[PDB]
């Protein structure tokens, strides 16, 4: 049966993720871009502009935390929509883990919009930890062969790039760059932690390579007073959401790519990471052209 | 492994659902009122009814209401979503049952039905509605949904009897919501009798007419390209909707009767509901403790 290789390139914005994936594809391989047209027009109007303005208004004291949250949560649902439909429509074609007959290079995974940016916004004070856990409860079941490439880039180098790689409506917010950089750092650790045998419930009280300390994983973000019962423990609803988070991330295959290099450098470095990656079979022989066409339609309609 | 029967009592509010289910080897996962009012946010139900009210009075714009409405529906469905998420792994294949779980509403209530009704009320974008649909969890085996039957004036009488803290009798929402659950029941029959929305979509320009299914709501101008074409993103979310709903097992309960009769009728529908196997020996006790803990923490 034919196999498929799926690779999601994720991480904080401003590292050169979209460039190098395109470079990679410029070499039976399809790119699924960020759905900017959905973000700027189809799902709502100028969602990215809406996000950075809200935070700024909040930061300026022009709106309250409750107003920012209402707006952020809503904006986050719009941001993740194309990721979620694509994942759900793709799911029945993914077979068991197995050159690839088709390689799909995605620009971000559903968790970017359902976990990472919400978690970072929570840290920024524009989202509640309860809403983040709601998003987490809705993260779609992790398909076999979910390979995630996260990016690394020194912060000073990132700050300079960030001034550069702005979006229309995006504002230079270093506090946010730091929050999102931290959130993704916690993400990589959580996967290792979970794969090294870590159980958040067993270590809750404590709040490649060896197993990380729970305090160096995403679980640590949820030590908020809002989620704690009068008896000091997490309410079970929130505890159950942490169970889903651990369940979703434990099966992902996470790789780190050094972006502190030239565009062709990142491309060849990614081209090299891509071999130790899990492929999977497809559910029907004709899943390949189907998948191929989904990606192309997605690209053609929402890419921009 | 032992067997389980999951039964989700759903439909518009104000029909007497919670009351008749309480009158029923069987656990009851109640309505998460504590989560709505305290745990996830403060007085979510009040927040919802008040926003619609300000919208209605022109005190706020449709976009302001949509942001609030969307944000709140996330708070409303959280308990259903995690429960489903944590439950999924124990549900085995379809097959007296070792355990009977009676849920007060299914995830689709907060991820499809209320959002759709709110769009019908002008307080939620259809793009938001389709984002929630896209997030509807895969439909596990043995998902039996009991929906209700009750004449409007009789429902109004009941609606009046029990409104949750913060509610405002809104006959236009009663109508929008009864419309949605009516279309829902029609959509399931449609999907089961072989209906293809992609194939029947043009008619909007033995089975229910697509114009009488949930698909008709998404012939919304915001979802269409300049030439009238539905954008693919939205068409794919309709594919998910079709996929999620088709495998559901729907049962209708006539509420136009007494609580014990409603209770009797419900227990009666049980004979045709689909049971499933659990995945582990220990699935039953674990499922039991979840349902009991949920009840304990979130039922007020
Ligand atoms: C995917 C995603 C991106 N973004 C921001 C990061 C960049 O500013 C820009 C494009 O990724 O949008 C969000 O704010 N939320 C999201 O969920
Ligand atoms: C389940 C649900 C209920 N409601 C309302 C209906 C009733 O007012 C109350 C209890 O069902 O909550 C919503 O507004 N949204 C939801 O998603």
XYZ file of C-alpha atoms and ligand atoms in Angstrom:
638
model
C 0.000 0.000 0.000
C 1.131 3.658 -0.639
C 2.577 5.653 2.297
C 2.294 9.292 3.283
C 4.662 11.569 5.124
C 3.115 14.495 7.002
C 5.290 17.224 8.509
C 3.945 20.211 10.435
C 6.409 23.033 10.776
C 5.391 25.017 13.866
C 6.760 27.452 16.375
C 6.717 31.187 17.186
C 6.091 33.525 14.318
C 9.107 35.414 12.932
C 11.602 32.547 12.539
C 11.364 32.001 8.791
C 9.124 28.967 8.987
C 7.035 29.729 5.900
C 10.066 30.455 3.709
C 12.007 27.319 4.322
C 9.016 25.008 3.962
C 8.397 26.512 0.524
C 12.052 26.143 -0.229
C 11.733 22.534 0.841
C 8.809 21.987 -1.478
C 10.593 23.657 -4.387
C 12.655 20.430 -4.466
C 4.509 14.117 -4.680
C 5.187 16.801 -2.106
C 2.607 19.446 -1.318
C 2.523 22.554 0.874
C -0.421 23.542 3.033
C 0.167 27.262 3.778
C -1.091 29.452 6.554
C -4.675 30.301 5.707
C -4.167 34.094 5.583
C -7.135 34.673 3.295
C -9.325 32.968 5.877
C -7.791 35.166 8.597
C -8.071 38.439 6.640
C -11.301 37.908 4.740
C -13.204 34.626 4.752
C -13.633 33.807 8.456
C -13.656 37.389 9.671
C -12.071 40.661 8.690
C -8.372 41.318 9.502
C -8.205 38.848 12.323
C -4.459 39.335 12.855
C -4.978 43.103 13.063
C -7.830 42.485 15.533
C -5.559 40.371 17.767
C -2.592 42.783 18.102
C -4.846 45.831 18.525
C -6.882 44.181 21.334
C -3.767 43.340 23.308
C -2.514 46.857 22.746
C -5.834 48.350 23.850
C -5.764 46.050 26.894
C -2.103 46.925 27.542
C -3.082 50.602 27.246
C -5.938 50.131 29.693
C -8.497 51.125 27.063
C -10.415 47.879 27.472
C -10.558 45.393 30.297
C -9.239 41.879 30.635
C -12.788 40.609 30.207
C -13.130 42.475 26.908
C -9.802 41.307 25.582
C -10.639 37.674 26.489
C -14.042 37.757 24.792
C -12.326 39.145 21.692
C -9.215 36.927 21.853
C -11.078 33.651 22.344
C -13.310 34.508 19.414
C -10.388 35.552 17.237
C -8.545 32.320 18.182
C -11.495 30.205 17.027
C -11.257 31.963 13.634
C -7.516 31.454 13.456
C -7.765 27.749 14.000
C -10.766 26.963 11.827
C -8.925 25.967 8.628
C -6.548 23.784 10.669
C -9.393 21.939 12.333
C -11.495 21.306 9.176
C -8.410 20.161 7.271
C -7.473 17.780 10.077
C -11.019 16.363 10.326
C -11.358 15.902 6.581
C -7.942 14.306 6.387
C -8.366 11.894 9.352
C -10.235 9.030 7.631
C -7.448 8.713 5.033
C -4.631 8.345 7.501
C -3.783 4.680 7.979
C -1.238 3.029 10.276
C 2.386 4.120 10.748
C 4.612 2.483 8.158
C 10.102 6.791 -0.330
C 6.740 8.439 0.535
C 4.180 8.459 -2.317
C 3.104 11.934 -1.076
C 4.664 14.297 1.418
C 2.477 17.035 2.917
C 4.372 19.933 4.440
C 2.065 21.910 6.654
C 2.470 25.400 7.853
C 1.470 24.914 11.520
C -0.539 22.192 13.237
C -3.997 22.536 14.840
C -2.381 22.921 18.286
C -0.865 26.254 17.302
C -4.337 27.824 17.198
C -5.944 25.518 19.806
C -3.159 25.473 22.433
C -0.010 27.546 21.877
C -1.317 30.993 20.959
C -4.177 30.696 23.485
C -1.722 29.664 26.220
C 0.552 32.592 25.255
C -2.420 34.988 25.255
C -3.405 33.653 28.649
C 0.116 34.574 29.847
C -0.456 37.999 28.232
C -3.590 38.436 30.287
C -5.975 38.492 27.302
C -7.445 35.025 27.779
C -8.544 33.060 30.820
C -6.904 29.730 31.706
C -10.386 28.165 31.576
C -10.888 29.146 27.924
C -7.406 27.743 27.028
C -8.389 24.398 28.627
C -11.665 24.512 26.670
C -9.590 24.798 23.472
C -7.347 21.962 24.718
C -10.430 19.804 25.347
C -11.228 20.306 21.663
C -7.788 19.484 20.230
C -8.527 16.774 17.625
C -7.362 13.187 18.225
C -3.659 12.868 17.260
C -3.321 11.004 14.020
C -0.604 8.395 13.533
C 2.594 9.849 12.103
C 2.088 13.356 13.425
C 5.574 14.755 12.970
C 6.064 18.271 14.382
C 9.111 20.356 13.559
C 9.475 23.191 16.094
C 11.932 26.034 15.512
C 14.875 27.283 17.614
C 16.413 30.756 17.185
C 18.269 32.902 19.729
C 15.981 35.591 21.080
C 18.066 38.631 20.058
C 18.233 37.144 16.540
C 14.449 36.555 16.771
C 13.771 40.138 17.941
C 15.632 41.517 14.916
C 13.777 39.174 12.601
C 10.520 39.959 14.289
C 10.908 43.665 13.484
C 11.237 42.316 9.922
C 8.711 39.485 9.487
C 5.551 41.427 10.556
C 2.053 40.592 9.339
C -0.510 43.181 8.122
C -2.012 44.351 11.405
C 0.728 42.795 13.463
C 2.403 44.951 16.108
C 5.877 44.457 17.496
C 5.168 43.014 20.909
C 8.261 41.572 22.586
C 6.310 40.538 25.662
C 4.229 38.362 23.325
C 7.271 37.121 21.417
C 8.642 35.992 24.813
C 5.352 34.361 25.862
C 4.971 32.442 22.613
C 8.664 31.492 22.609
C 8.205 30.202 26.138
C 4.959 28.367 25.389
C 6.566 26.483 22.455
C 9.571 25.731 24.658
C 7.221 24.182 27.215
C 5.531 22.270 24.386
C 8.681 20.513 23.264
C 9.460 19.581 26.918
C 5.963 18.264 27.555
C 6.255 15.844 24.666
C 9.659 14.595 25.968
C 8.303 14.525 29.520
C 5.315 12.441 28.399
C 7.371 10.168 26.238
C 9.922 9.675 29.061
C 7.147 8.289 31.262
C 6.010 11.470 33.035
C 2.549 11.568 34.587
C 1.360 15.069 35.479
C -0.958 13.791 38.238
C 1.936 11.995 39.952
C 4.152 15.106 39.820
C 1.527 17.804 40.209
C 2.768 18.424 43.705
C 6.263 19.191 42.483
C 5.015 22.543 41.099
C 16.061 13.789 23.210
C 17.634 13.998 26.655
C 16.353 13.023 30.102
C 12.837 13.515 31.375
C 12.086 17.265 32.061
C 10.727 18.616 35.354
C 6.922 19.120 35.238
C 7.586 22.786 36.001
C 9.382 22.947 32.632
C 6.342 21.584 30.744
C 2.916 23.136 29.799
C 1.267 21.584 32.842
C 2.877 24.329 34.895
C 0.770 27.043 33.247
C -2.318 25.636 34.835
C -1.382 26.320 38.426
C -3.805 29.241 38.381
C -6.075 30.173 41.350
C -9.060 30.195 38.994
C -8.705 26.480 38.350
C -8.132 25.552 42.001
C -10.777 24.303 44.397
C -11.083 25.699 47.963
C -9.205 22.511 48.996
C -6.181 23.554 46.848
C -6.506 20.890 44.129
C -7.432 21.311 40.482
C -11.132 21.035 39.849
C -11.717 17.726 38.073
C -12.990 19.439 34.871
C -9.611 21.121 34.528
C -7.787 17.978 35.603
C -9.621 16.037 32.881
C -8.544 18.655 30.335
C -4.889 18.103 31.365
C -5.452 14.377 30.762
C -6.531 15.152 27.165
C -3.513 17.415 26.676
C -1.186 14.630 27.771
C -3.089 12.180 25.602
C -2.842 14.396 22.493
C 0.860 15.260 22.793
C 2.213 11.806 23.767
C 1.867 10.361 20.276
C 3.368 13.288 18.358
C 6.840 12.997 16.892
C 8.594 16.262 17.706
C 11.756 17.536 15.938
C 13.636 20.796 16.477
C 15.032 22.853 13.590
C 17.724 25.497 13.969
C 16.595 28.652 12.233
C 19.746 30.502 13.109
C 21.048 29.878 9.587
C 20.450 30.850 5.957
C 17.172 30.005 4.193
C 18.803 27.237 2.093
C 20.548 26.182 5.312
C 17.218 25.733 7.148
C 15.855 23.937 4.058
C 18.694 21.394 3.911
C 18.632 21.018 7.715
C 14.863 20.323 7.470
C 15.424 18.102 4.439
C 17.738 16.112 6.733
C 15.342 15.999 9.736
C 12.640 14.636 7.418
C 14.207 11.155 7.037
C 13.970 10.008 10.652
C 10.246 10.808 10.294
C 7.268 8.481 10.547
C 5.201 7.860 7.433
C 1.850 6.113 7.426
C -0.242 4.227 4.956
C -3.410 5.630 3.438
C -6.839 4.143 3.935
C -7.708 3.783 0.275
C -5.367 3.526 -2.714
C -7.035 6.699 -4.065
C -6.525 8.593 -0.777
C -3.290 10.038 -2.219
C -4.816 12.110 -5.091
C -7.674 13.015 -2.766
C -5.246 14.213 -0.108
C -3.192 15.837 -2.788
C -6.178 17.771 -4.039
C -7.325 18.838 -0.563
C -3.906 20.434 0.012
C -3.938 22.129 -3.352
C -7.470 23.484 -2.882
C -6.605 24.662 0.599
C -3.513 26.379 -0.796
C -5.330 27.988 -3.736
C -8.258 29.257 -1.585
C -6.638 30.315 1.691
C -2.984 30.794 0.931
C -1.842 34.461 0.794
C -15.716 -6.757 28.078
C -19.025 -5.677 29.729
C -21.449 -3.437 27.840
C -22.541 0.158 28.149
C -25.580 2.135 27.015
C -24.980 5.904 26.742
C -28.105 8.037 26.363
C -27.933 11.797 25.739
C -31.235 13.601 26.456
C -31.138 16.689 24.256
C -33.354 19.257 22.552
C -34.572 22.768 23.270
C -34.604 24.002 26.853
C -37.935 24.449 28.660
C -39.393 21.049 27.696
C -38.822 19.374 31.074
C -35.775 17.280 30.115
C -33.734 17.545 33.314
C -36.854 16.882 35.400
C -37.932 13.731 33.581
C -34.418 12.261 33.435
C -33.961 12.651 37.217
C -37.101 10.605 37.621
C -35.220 7.679 36.052
C -26.347 0.311 37.063
C -27.378 3.789 35.851
C -25.685 7.165 36.356
C -26.912 10.606 35.472
C -24.386 13.183 34.171
C -26.360 16.373 35.034
C -26.318 19.797 33.480
C -22.995 21.533 34.416
C -24.626 24.555 36.043
C -21.735 25.147 38.473
C -19.268 25.350 35.583
C -21.459 27.805 33.731
C -22.132 30.047 36.718
C -18.849 29.818 38.614
C -16.062 27.478 37.371
C -15.464 28.518 33.755
C -16.854 32.003 33.948
C -19.273 33.995 36.068
C -22.995 33.574 35.168
C -22.543 32.426 31.575
C -26.286 31.908 31.028
C -26.994 35.493 32.163
C -24.214 36.769 29.988
C -25.813 35.101 26.974
C -29.392 36.312 27.493
C -28.243 39.826 28.402
C -26.117 40.245 25.256
C -28.954 39.135 22.997
C -31.077 41.632 24.864
C -28.656 44.501 24.267
C -28.430 43.439 20.617
C -32.246 43.387 20.341
C -32.474 46.874 21.902
C -29.711 48.149 19.592
C -27.449 48.916 22.547
C -24.629 46.908 20.914
C -23.805 45.840 17.362
C -24.127 42.400 15.812
C -20.334 42.014 15.852
C -20.014 42.763 19.602
C -22.746 40.253 20.356
C -21.082 37.667 18.111
C -17.818 37.950 19.952
C -19.544 37.540 23.275
C -21.862 34.817 22.009
C -18.927 32.835 20.519
C -16.735 33.207 23.616
C -19.619 32.056 25.884
C -20.524 28.996 23.806
C -16.968 27.869 24.427
C -17.629 28.091 28.197
C -21.018 26.323 27.789
C -19.684 23.279 25.964
C -16.407 22.704 27.856
C -17.849 20.132 30.281
C -19.422 18.156 27.388
C -16.213 18.268 25.369
C -13.841 17.032 28.108
C -16.309 14.404 29.250
C -16.469 13.176 25.687
C -12.679 13.394 25.342
C -12.002 11.421 28.522
C -14.773 8.954 27.720
C -13.785 8.168 24.143
C -10.954 5.682 24.950
C -13.274 3.342 26.929
C -15.937 3.079 24.243
C -15.513 -0.068 22.237
C -17.549 -1.431 19.376
C -21.313 -1.583 19.111
C -23.233 -4.606 20.310
C -28.695 -6.062 29.873
C -25.900 -3.391 29.842
C -23.415 -3.287 32.715
C -23.834 0.507 32.954
C -26.337 3.016 31.603
C -25.174 6.629 31.362
C -27.876 9.279 31.075
C -26.374 12.565 29.959
C -28.047 15.890 30.212
C -27.316 17.034 26.632
C -24.684 16.000 23.996
C -21.622 18.047 22.854
C -23.497 19.018 19.677
C -25.836 21.125 21.814
C -23.023 23.621 22.472
C -20.963 23.026 19.333
C -23.784 23.014 16.790
C -27.320 23.606 18.008
C -27.122 26.664 20.176
C -24.552 28.355 17.936
C -26.876 27.751 14.920
C -29.851 29.158 16.861
C -27.794 32.199 17.839
C -26.819 32.734 14.202
C -30.569 32.561 13.490
C -30.892 35.313 16.123
C -28.249 37.454 14.486
C -25.772 37.034 17.344
C -23.232 34.549 15.925
C -21.441 34.520 12.533
C -22.020 31.387 10.422
C -18.206 31.141 10.145
C -18.116 30.828 13.940
C -20.884 28.254 13.757
C -18.882 26.219 11.213
C -15.677 26.540 13.326
C -17.552 24.787 16.212
C -18.868 22.155 13.766
C -15.327 21.511 12.531
C -14.473 20.895 16.159
C -17.260 18.381 16.825
C -15.566 15.216 18.130
C -15.783 11.991 16.104
C -19.052 10.203 16.802
C -18.321 7.199 19.017
C -20.260 3.966 18.596
C -23.585 3.733 20.409
C -24.307 7.461 20.510
C -28.071 7.514 21.191
C -29.619 11.011 21.213
C -33.097 11.513 22.611
C -34.694 14.641 21.251
C -38.046 16.072 22.367
C -41.538 16.678 20.956
C -43.740 19.384 22.490
C -46.243 21.860 20.823
C -45.044 25.445 20.967
C -47.677 26.980 23.285
C -47.242 24.056 25.702
C -43.454 24.549 25.469
C -43.855 28.295 26.169
C -45.881 27.353 29.314
C -43.058 24.991 30.360
C -40.285 27.399 29.341
C -41.940 29.896 31.708
C -41.978 27.302 34.547
C -38.195 26.812 34.535
C -35.691 29.365 33.405
C -32.082 29.006 34.616
C -30.503 31.828 36.698
C -29.934 34.693 34.285
C -32.332 33.575 31.530
C -34.852 35.927 29.887
C -37.987 34.397 28.309
C -37.223 34.977 24.661
C -39.881 33.525 22.374
C -37.764 34.341 19.344
C -34.924 32.183 20.822
C -37.461 29.476 21.654
C -38.453 29.561 18.005
C -34.843 29.683 16.699
C -33.856 26.791 18.963
C -36.903 24.634 18.213
C -36.172 25.331 14.524
C -32.584 24.109 14.896
C -33.455 20.872 16.702
C -36.196 20.250 14.160
C -33.726 20.629 11.267
C -31.254 18.456 13.195
C -33.682 15.554 13.412
C -34.431 16.059 9.720
C -30.737 16.096 8.827
C -30.041 12.756 10.497
C -32.915 11.084 8.588
C -31.641 12.827 5.431
C -28.086 11.540 5.899
C -29.262 8.019 6.760
C -31.507 7.762 3.683
C -28.488 8.482 1.566
C -28.715 12.220 1.253
C -25.695 14.002 -0.255
C -25.619 17.741 0.457
C -23.123 18.411 -2.304
C -25.469 16.739 -4.730
C -28.654 18.422 -3.343
C -27.177 21.903 -2.760
C -28.526 23.275 -6.044
C -32.136 22.722 -4.988
C -31.653 25.497 -2.390
C -30.975 27.860 -5.270
C -37.956 8.879 0.554
C -36.121 11.728 2.404
C -36.403 15.291 3.766
C -35.799 18.119 1.295
C -32.340 19.565 1.934
C -34.231 22.806 2.478
C -35.568 21.156 5.584
C -32.147 20.049 6.876
C -29.381 21.946 8.708
C -27.671 22.520 5.388
C -30.100 25.243 4.443
C -28.697 27.587 7.165
C -25.313 27.615 5.517
C -26.536 29.012 2.213
C -25.456 32.183 4.047
C -23.941 35.095 2.022
C -20.941 35.330 4.316
C -19.991 31.776 3.300
C -20.215 32.282 -0.442
C -17.785 33.458 -3.060
C -18.780 36.378 -5.372
C -20.153 33.860 -7.879
C -22.342 32.243 -5.264
C -20.049 29.312 -4.691
C -19.677 28.032 -1.151
C -15.986 28.410 -0.194
C -14.282 24.977 0.111
C -13.337 25.576 3.786
C -17.027 25.832 4.590
C -17.957 22.972 2.269
C -15.466 20.796 4.130
C -17.033 21.787 7.470
C -20.346 20.635 5.985
C -18.661 17.320 5.185
C -17.645 17.000 8.860
C -21.221 17.896 9.917
C -22.590 15.194 7.613
C -20.046 12.682 8.913
C -20.682 13.428 12.601
C -24.500 13.393 12.412
C -25.074 10.420 10.151
C -23.846 7.872 12.634
C -26.028 9.129 15.453
C -29.058 7.198 16.650
C -31.936 9.613 17.234
C -34.997 8.895 19.427
C -37.999 11.156 19.890
C -39.685 11.701 23.232
C -43.126 13.255 23.387
C -42.891 15.617 26.316
C -46.516 16.595 26.070
C -47.288 14.311 29.020
C -46.677 13.915 32.784
C -43.139 13.627 34.319
C -43.595 9.944 35.197
C -45.113 9.314 31.743
C -42.233 11.217 30.150
C -40.082 9.085 32.421
C -41.880 5.905 31.304
C -41.648 6.783 27.610
C -37.892 7.450 27.940
C -37.129 4.120 29.597
C -39.280 2.733 26.784
C -37.062 4.134 23.986
C -34.224 2.246 25.590
C -34.993 -1.064 23.830
C -33.884 0.277 20.467
C -30.798 2.211 21.597
C -27.382 0.918 20.688
C -25.086 -0.468 23.335
C -21.405 -0.874 22.997
C -18.606 -2.728 24.649
C -16.162 -0.999 26.922
C -12.471 -1.211 26.151
C -11.078 -2.528 29.481
C -12.407 -4.597 32.435
C -12.030 -1.493 34.527
C -13.780 0.786 32.058
C -17.185 0.526 33.822
C -16.035 1.662 37.363
C -13.869 4.390 35.822
C -16.796 5.595 33.679
C -18.973 5.402 36.781
C -16.583 7.532 38.880
C -16.337 10.137 36.089
C -20.092 10.465 35.792
C -20.389 10.688 39.589
C -17.522 13.156 39.967
C -18.923 15.290 37.107
C -22.328 15.285 38.831
C -20.804 16.154 42.199
C -18.626 19.015 41.007
C -20.695 20.589 38.246
C -24.306 19.890 39.008
C -25.443 22.665 41.329
C -1.702 30.425 14.033
C -1.773 31.803 14.810
C -1.030 32.850 14.486
N -1.134 34.067 15.183
C -0.304 35.287 14.851
C 1.164 35.064 14.732
C 1.596 35.995 13.704
O 1.336 37.214 14.327
C 0.566 35.799 12.721
C 0.737 34.723 11.683
O 1.095 33.456 12.223
O -0.606 35.588 13.515
C -1.997 34.239 16.234
O -2.050 35.285 16.869
N -2.749 33.185 16.574
C -2.703 31.939 15.932
O -3.436 31.006 16.328
C -26.354 23.821 26.230
C -26.572 25.312 26.078
C -27.599 25.885 26.720
N -27.909 27.198 26.650
C -29.031 27.701 27.463
C -30.377 27.094 27.335
C -31.010 27.302 28.702
O -31.110 28.679 28.871
C -29.915 26.891 29.652
C -30.015 25.428 30.002
O -30.140 24.566 28.824
O -28.803 27.274 28.847
C -27.209 28.026 25.879
O -27.434 29.217 25.712
N -26.135 27.426 25.234
C -25.748 26.079 25.255
O -24.795 25.678 24.552
